[PDB]
């Protein structure tokens, strides 16, 4: 049967996307920029959580340091502005999930409960309820108003490197180090379906905006998953690229993946076609292992990628508006077939 | 004897545990309500006329110079 599928693949054509170039570089923090998150209501400013613990807010247009925020103690591993209500959630290895209010620039409510240094926060899009999960191997669910944990989605057998809150029945996509991913009947307190198509730490996951799917990463492979049924959608061509740290998808089906190699990958989300590799640069003084993109996100526009690299740099990427199907095409896509996943 | 951390205290057990019903300090209701969005003399001398390394920053060396003597 393989030959049929392969033939079908060859028949189809992954569309051309404009490639990328390093538009802006910001040596802002004094640590790794492990978290980056961008305001989805206005597309004006984006904050980034350092290892220093001082999450700093950055205007896009200028690029300048809008303002620092330092309520945490340990590395702010993740943050998440809620477009729904003006609350910047954040989270550190100090186990706090502090909710800032940007109408005041202070912190408002802490969410105590988490046993171990929480790695990720995701706010629920259609509720006043937020999801968080860390080394505890538990994806908790906080009612914001009342600042209690409502429910605790036990299941995972190992730390839980990412999480994504969606509006549907599978309200949580929990991506763990346990070489799994879970979709949850949140109301039930049960994994509705559990995809496991990963050899290694599933340590970079992203919801697609207008598709209702979620890409996940392993050490190399980068599946993309359709979370209605709880079904696979598409294997990718990530066969030689590094350990994926972050995996932010664009609005226009332009799935990003960030390498521990340092190499910025770039995929057509629909197909899997690796339509640009880009070996990143480090700052003059750095060491060659340090060039590692540890964070990433796209704007509302989708025309600016922001990447929290370990060179203490917040690099930003434009799509080339001078590009065509002849002036910089993709990397001449070819499904390899060598006992492959495609 | 005394050993590094490997497999964290997983909140599976804490979930299956019974409630305590204590009243902690911070779980007292703070900020009840939520916000929302809208939606001649000078001749006679001998001589008459960024890096990303925290250990090699100009600030750092200078600092050390200041705080040693």
């Amino acid at each position: 049967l393989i030959v049929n599928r392969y033939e079908k693949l060859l028949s189809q054509r992954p569309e051309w996307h404009a490639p990328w170039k390093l538009s802006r570089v910001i040596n802002g923090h004094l640590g790794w920029v492990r978290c980056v998150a961008i305001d989805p209501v206005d597309n004006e400013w984006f904050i980034t959580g350092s290892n220093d613990t001082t999450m700093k807010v950055w205007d896009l247009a200028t690029g300048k340091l809008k303002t620092t925020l330092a309520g945490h103690v340990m590395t702010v591993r993740d943050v998440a502005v809620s477009d729904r209500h003006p609350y910047l959630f954040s989270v550190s290895e100090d186990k706090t999930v502090k909710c800032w209010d940007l109408e005041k620039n202070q912190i408002i409510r802490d969410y105590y409960g988490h046993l171990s240094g929480v790695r990720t926060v995701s706010i629920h899009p259609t509720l006043d309820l937020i999801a968080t999960a860390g080394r505890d191997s538990v994806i908790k669910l906080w009612d914001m108003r009342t600042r209690i944990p409502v429910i605790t989605l036990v299941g995972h057998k190992g730390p839980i490197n990412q999480v994504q809150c969606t509006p549907v029945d599978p309200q949580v996509v929990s991506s763990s180090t346990d070489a799994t991913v879970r979709l949850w009947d949140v109301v039930a307190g049960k994994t509705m379906k559990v995809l496991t198509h990963h050899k290694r730490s599933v340590r970079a996951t992203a919801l697609h905006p207008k598709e209702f799917s979620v890409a996940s990463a392993c050490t190399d492979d980068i599946r993309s998953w359709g979370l209605a049924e709880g079904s696979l959608l598409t294997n990718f061509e990530s066969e030689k690229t590094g350990i994926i740290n972050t995996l932010s998808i664009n609005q226009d089906d332009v799935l990003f993946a960030g390498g521990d190699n340092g190499v910025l990958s770039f995929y057509d989300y629909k197909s899997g076609h690796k339509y640009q590799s880009l070996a990143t640069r480090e700052m003059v003084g750095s060491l060659e292992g340090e060039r590692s993109v540890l964070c990433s996100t796209f704007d509302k526009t989708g025309l600016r990628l922001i990447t929290g690299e370990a060179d203490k740099s917040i690099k930003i990427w434009k799509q080339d508006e001078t590009a065509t199907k002849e002036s910089e095409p993709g990397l001449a896509w070819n499904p390899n077939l060598s006992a492959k996943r495609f | 004897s005394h050993r590094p951390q490997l497999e964290a205290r997983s909140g599976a057990k804490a979930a299956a545990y019974t409630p305590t019903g204590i009243e902690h300090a911070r779980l007292l209701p703070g900020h009840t309500t939520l916000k929302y969005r809208k939606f001649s003399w000078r001749k006679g001398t001998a001589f008459g006329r960024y890096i990303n390394d925290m250990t090699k920053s100009e600030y750092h060396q200078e600092f050390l110079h200041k705080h040693v003597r």
């Binding site: 390093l22 538009s23 570089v25 910001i26 040596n27 303002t67 910047l88 005041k104 620039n105 | 809208k38």
Partner: peptide, 29 residues
């Protein structure tokens, strides 16, 4: 990189001095 179209910025201080909010309180007049 002093030559290239990559525009580097070694920022330090805040523009808005932790008073000017990041989002503004919408209201009646």
């Amino acid at each position: 990189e002093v030559e290239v179209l990559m525009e580097t910025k070694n920022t330090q201080s805040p523009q808005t001095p932790l008073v000017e909010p990041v989002t503004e309180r919408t209201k009646l007049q």
